């Protein structure tokens, strides 16, 4: 119909390999900000047959026990035995992990107050908040996370013993343009993709995956007799996880984030501290769009930053409104300047960014989920 | 001004640890297909101190020297000596490479004719062009990658000895908003961090970058009295490559795209074969995009398609002119409908994609550049 279009976004399981590297690399600095709240870490994580491994930068006064630390992740995602191709127990965990370069430490961190600590990077980074759901995030990537964490659950729970945790899902809603804002209408096509064991097979699968995955997620008002459903459409996924296909940190950020929409500025959450602010102020821009949202200002809003290593301010701010506001961009941007402090050394006070909840974050998206602080809005003075 | 907007983007070079890999990864890939034009690759490389790992699954009929590849791309990036931080003649090469996993290839392309050939994947992938630059692509980025070439270039003629292979620039720039197209006005900010010898002092650096570097390659009328430079900002910048910092394929997939603008589905391009459609679909959403602006139907445009693991044809596919078109985004859809064919087994064929040249494409940006095949417009037809 004249006015609407098609978006589709994904959303992977706990167990695919990428995200197992994001939940290690994450399981790491919930581990040093546990002993030390101002670790320098930068733990990149890679996943293939039976290897962990950890590559990176970590300046930290913790005392870590990476072996046990990494199993007890993997542990948790459910990779507990050769036959599902992958074991905490037996694994091999690889460590090539040195202190943080003395010349970033020295451009950033080092002899500064913490307010005016450095961006540990230059970078830019986008926040993003739309009012088509209460949780302020695009339907199409909460509709695919939720499916990935329905799987878990019955996995979990030993409803379907035959999955496994490697899965992905992808959603495509029909939208209804208004005003700037979007409306979803319907559900268009779902894809679900799961690893499984030897024995079940692919009708019983593709029926459970529909009434039992589908349908305990997906409102009935969105599904249609149009609505086209590729469940298990490559026909056979019994290889899964590290062992199907090699993982690493940083290589679901569209997942992270809002699955396609708004922007990104192409930096990794997982594995990094606060003065990173690939994470930080993403986080930051997130908890901006929100509140804009929130306040009633924004039904949808796009905020851009951008930062020089070693220098706290950001170097750019900008607001998108998408036509969604009755106040302009400039006066957007100046409710923005009026109340938020977007340095580093600001942010991780109000967002608590020392707090080991990292490893919470590195499934399932890092925004509109479990009002972490970012999801809180701020009450805005103008 | 009212009509004005900042925005940045950021380019890494050669010798960053992230670039380092993909384009290892891609050499891996053309290695390959200069025997086996057919060969399934899925290469992830990882860079940390002394150690390049590639990880993942290739199933080929090519015989192929992984020392000999990988230490080559290595030495062309320029990183040939201890005093650099890392050597292609003594750096260690692990691998750890297993065949592509059966239950993906039965899935994919077992018995498949070309043409019907599954996608390899599901996901989401978005192509974007806008008139603003000849080539098509957005300012910012192109400035960007321009000033990561003119450092390489400069170290390699020995104008500036003191230069390593690891930088990183990011340029901000004010736009005026015309109908949905945007119109440069100035350069508001550029960083420029690069990695250089223990005896160049700061003052020589910010010098010569701003005099050999910065005014070599951005056009004195966006520069002006008010246009802010940070040079070197972390002040000392000796440590760098994979030993700065851990390198992984894919973890700059938005300087391998447009830096920001349009949007990005989340896949990485380098070292993956024609049948992932992370790489195929995005290189055709582009040829699609940049063949909708050369062809006069729009200023400025957004495409998304998305696939779902063994299936050919996309799942949707969506058009945004950004109101820069007098054909409604449903005609557009159906002159797109009639002029692509955008199955990989199709897209293959229109875009040459078993030719190795895939570490061409793995720095600088993988559009706007070299009229590779995806960069030059098709005429429409309607
Ligand atoms: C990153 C991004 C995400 C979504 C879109 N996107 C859109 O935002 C609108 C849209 C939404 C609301 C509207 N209100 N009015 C009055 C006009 C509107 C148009 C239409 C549209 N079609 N295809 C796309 C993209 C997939 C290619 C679209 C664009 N860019
Ligand atoms: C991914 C993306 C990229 C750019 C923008 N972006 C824009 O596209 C326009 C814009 C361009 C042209 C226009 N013509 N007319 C009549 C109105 C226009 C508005 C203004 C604007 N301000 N901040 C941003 C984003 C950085 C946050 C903006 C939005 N999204
Ligand atoms: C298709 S693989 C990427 C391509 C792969 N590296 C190759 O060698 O072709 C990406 C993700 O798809 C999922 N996957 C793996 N095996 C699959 C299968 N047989 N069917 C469907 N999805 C699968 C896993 O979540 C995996 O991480
Ligand atoms: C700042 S590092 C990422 C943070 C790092 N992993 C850490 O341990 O803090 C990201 C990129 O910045 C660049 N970089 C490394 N050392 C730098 C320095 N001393 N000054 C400026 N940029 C640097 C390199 O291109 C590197 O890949």
Redesign the interface.
């Known amino acids: 119909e ?1 006015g609407t ?6 959303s992977v399981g706990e167990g695919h390999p990428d995200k197992i590297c994001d939940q290690i690399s994450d399981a790491v600095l919930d581990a040093h900000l546990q002993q030390d709240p101002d670790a320098k870490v ?1 733990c ?1 994580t ?1 996943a ?2 039976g ?1 962990i ?1 950890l ?3 970590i300046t930290s006064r913790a005392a870590v026990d990476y072996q046990k630390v990494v199993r007890e992740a993997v542990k948790h995602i459910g990779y507990d035995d050769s036959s599902k191709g992958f074991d905490y127990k037996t694994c091999n965990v690889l460590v ?1 992990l ?1 202190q943080q ?4 430490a ?3 961190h080092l002899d500064r107050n913490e307010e005016d600590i ?1 961006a540990g990077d ?3 980074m ?1 926040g993003y908040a739309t009012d088509e759901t209460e949780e302020c995030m695009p339907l199409t990537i909460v509709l695919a996370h939720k499916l990935n964490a329905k799987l878990a659950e019955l996995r979990r729970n030993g409803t379907l013993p035959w999955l496994r945790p490697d899965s ?1 899902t ?1 959603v ?1 809603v029909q939208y209804m343009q208004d005003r700037g804002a979007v409306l979803p209408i319907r559900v ?2 779902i ?1 679900i ?1 799961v690893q499984h064991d030897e024995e079940v097979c692919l009708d019983e699968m593709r029926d459970a995956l529909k009434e039992k995955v589908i349908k305990a997620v997906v409102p009935a008002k969105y599904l249609d007799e149009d609505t ?1 459903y ?1 469940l298990q ?7 899964g996880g590290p ?4 993982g ?8 992270d984030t809002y699955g ?2 708004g ?4 930096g ?1 959450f997982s594995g990094k501290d606060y003065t990173k602010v690939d994470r930080s102020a993403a986080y930051a821009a997130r908890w901006v769009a929100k509140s804009l949202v929130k306040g009633g200002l924004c039904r949808r809003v796009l905020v ?1 930053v ?1 930062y ?4 706290s301010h950001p ?4 607001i ?1 409104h998408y036509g969604t506001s009755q106040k ?3 006066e957007l941007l100046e409710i923005v300047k009026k109340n938020f402090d977007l340095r580093p050394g600001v942010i991780v006070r109000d967002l608590d960014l020392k707090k080991p909840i990292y490893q919470r974050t590195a499934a399932y998206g890092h925004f509109g989920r479990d009002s972490f602080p970012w999801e809180v809005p701020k009450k805005l003075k103008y």
Request: no cysteine.
């Open positions: 004249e279009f098609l978006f589709t976004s994904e930068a990149e890679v293939k047959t290897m491994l590559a990176g930068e090539a040195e370069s003395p010349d970033i020295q451009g950033v450095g230059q970078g830019l986008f992905k992808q495509t268009h096509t894809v993709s086209i590729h459409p490559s026909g056979r996924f019994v290889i062992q199907g296909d090699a690493l940190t940083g290589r679901k950020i569209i997942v396609g929409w922007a990104h500025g192409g990794a851009q951008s020089a290593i070693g220098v170097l750019s701010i900008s998108f302009s961009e400039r």
